[model samples]
Target: GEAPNQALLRILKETEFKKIKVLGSGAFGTVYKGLWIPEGEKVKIPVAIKELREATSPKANKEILDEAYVMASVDNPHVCRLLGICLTSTVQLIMQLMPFGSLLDYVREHKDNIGSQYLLNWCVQIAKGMNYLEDRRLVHRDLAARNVLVKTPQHVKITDFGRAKLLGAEEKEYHAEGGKVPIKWMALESILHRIYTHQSDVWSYGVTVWELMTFGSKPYDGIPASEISSILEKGERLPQPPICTIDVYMIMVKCWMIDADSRPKFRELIIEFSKMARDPQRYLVIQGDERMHEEDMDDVVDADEYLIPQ
Candidate 1:
């Protein structure tokens, strides 16, 4: 017999878990913040419960397990750490409760004074987590501000692996239906149906960085996602520089390079972003050192320093 629907609540109730509040909701499900006190124990812990209302696809079952595998693979403090799983085919994703909602929410509430210094700090935390995944030959295809959660003012964590792809040991190309992709936030190669590699993730990171600095606006607003794709193919990009910093703007530009090879490797990206985060004044002059030459921005097939060819 299928696991009882009541089993979830019973498991929580038996363990002295109580729902504290609702975090967010989507068409497919809702997330609740809860507190749990173990029986015969004196401590209480915070948790988030992901409840799936109904099956959206027959593949939904596999997706849950896949998410579990992906989350388990990443163990960064700035990355949303999965605590445990509530295994039932109907509904259940027991996760650690992130105190601050998401980067999107944070910036929404504090947009005016978000400046380059603040955005630089948050972006560094994000790059650290991304570097870890890139080191493991993984690409988070759907990186966005909405997917990044701030555990505290000093710590940020990346979450939501429902759209992540694993570029494991097999050095091969993978393709998805163009219609199913997030074209507005995609890299040119990915938008052009070339392939999604770690560099492609870097492209998304640039857009994510923009999202963080802009206080949560939709990417390429007022334009269709396809038109955004078209503009990207022609080398057009987000026009306004967030936070008014040339170095940071250049970093975003590099990520959106037409040639995937031109994008910095995750470690290089980590170093650049981290340095800026630690001391913006130290690297702000990098923008004036030399403009990145055109030839350095061509598509050359090679694995990034951080990831094995895949």
Candidate 2:
């Protein structure tokens, strides 16, 4: 028999949940620590409630449910899962509380104590999560460090699927119309033609890795979105970060390739990253080609800022 519309999320009453304090605020809304004590299910579950700040409407509810469906379908260990949904007070999507907050903030604050191995591990975990989405034919239109959550010192999970699209299994491309776009992290075709595919996600993942390598410094610093097209047309790219190795920069360059076909797939990246993570010492000893991408830099670039420290 054909199935009716099944439940995507368990509806929880507002009275059952108690808000603690703000974790942080972003373009989406503020996330708060929550205590969920359902009627007889009074176990008092700790959760992270993503409370939407905008006026609630039919369209808003649709989008909230859309995000929940996508998250519930994607239950990988490296991807954030939707615990449930609240019906009262401006649609809320309840999730597992990530004490460390966003990966962007964590790396920036703890860069001094974090080792290179942990950094590589995070990159691979991200790749694995993205690969899962790729297999499911879901396009994460917005992929960045800020969208990723740090569950623990050793665990990182992809989050913020509000902008994600679940495409037909046959569709290879996703076209976007409105809402905010991450221009700097976008692929060339994405910025120019508003086209999106798994390759575009690859491009964003590369930028995310670059952020990790730089200890969370903003990429393409000092550049405005107004002139990004001209700069990209000129084949200019963000200069190699001071601390990045040749092996790591090579991967970044591959993702920045003008032709999407030339870029490495998420699965391909996962394989390479896994190897490096296993034999990290073998990679540090790798040299050569570090100077090869130098010509890609423009004369306006300051060589000192990109110097790889010895």
Candidate 3:
């Protein structure tokens, strides 16, 4: 009698999983770092289960499962992967565990004790994952150090697709009249006019790279939201980090180019980072992008958006 969502993903049974302890929690409810030990297989599969907050109505339940569907749709080394959905008294998204927590916390925790080459390589890893998303027809809409998970010290994976979407056929962007967006990370056009596109994302990527360079310092510190558009309108950009090489700084600047066409696509960004790996001396020969942004940008990823009252 209780069947339907089976095709969306394997409907996981709660009994099969062994809960270890709390990994994290939010408005979504508890996230248990647990293991799924399947029948006839003794090896444990590591997972982080998002035990969702109460859904008092059927519609809300549907929305939650749909969100899991989107997460399951993406399979990339850099994007968090959903294993299945577990439903008992509540719903849960069984996902691969990213043990080191968020990239934001990692950098702040480690400080700049790490080397330049690793910092540069981390940027490459993120771009490769993001490029896969772009190729698959999805826009992460929100990409920042906060949304990145440290799968291990050497790698990071994009997490929290709660704000992500797949653009329609031939569609290149997503627009909104007014929704609360991550103000500081936004591009000028998106900051002021509410436009969103791959180009807008490139602008956000610029700020994100700045964040990596700064070792997790908040963007636009001291400046409130209202003043953000005003200053960016006047041709402002984040100052380069003391430890960051001049060439890497140039790459971030290219991403921020006001003319969207001039901004590098994720495709070109991959090449930019790879070139750095091949050469240790110069770091980057940095230069430039082509026509697409005829536009704008935008968030930290999680925290703030909570659950239902009734």
Q: Which candidate is the best by lDDT?
A: 2
TM-score, one value per model: 0.80, 0.85, 0.82
Model 3 regions lying over 4 Å from their true place: 1-8, 55-62, 280-310
Per-residue lDDT of 82-131 in model 2, one digit per residue for the tens?
87788755678888777778999998897666666677789889999999
Among all windows of ten consecutive residues in candidate 1, which has the lowest summed lDDT? 301-310
Candidate 1 overall lDDT versus native: 0.68
Candidate 2 local distance difference test against the native: 0.78
On lDDT, the stronger of 2 and 3 is 2
| Clash totals in order | 1, 0, 2
* Window of ten residues with lowest summed lDDT in model 2: 301-310
Candidate scoring better on TM-score of 2 and 3: 2
Which residue pairs in candidate 3 have backbone atoms (N, alpha carbon, C) closer than 3 angstroms, thus clashing? 187-297, 200-296
lDDT of 1 by residue, 1-310 (tens): 3322231112334245556577878864778887555566445566777766645574466646667667755666666655556655544666677777888888888665455555777788788888887776677888889888876666678888877777745654456655466777778777777588878888888999888756688888898985776776666789654344777778888898887889987788778887876665443332332321111223243221112111
The alpha-carbon lDDT assigned to residue 183 of candidate 2 equals 88
If both were scored by lDDT, which would come out higher, candidate 1 or candidate 2?
A: 2
lDDT of each: 0.68, 0.78, 0.73
Top model by TM-score, which number? 2
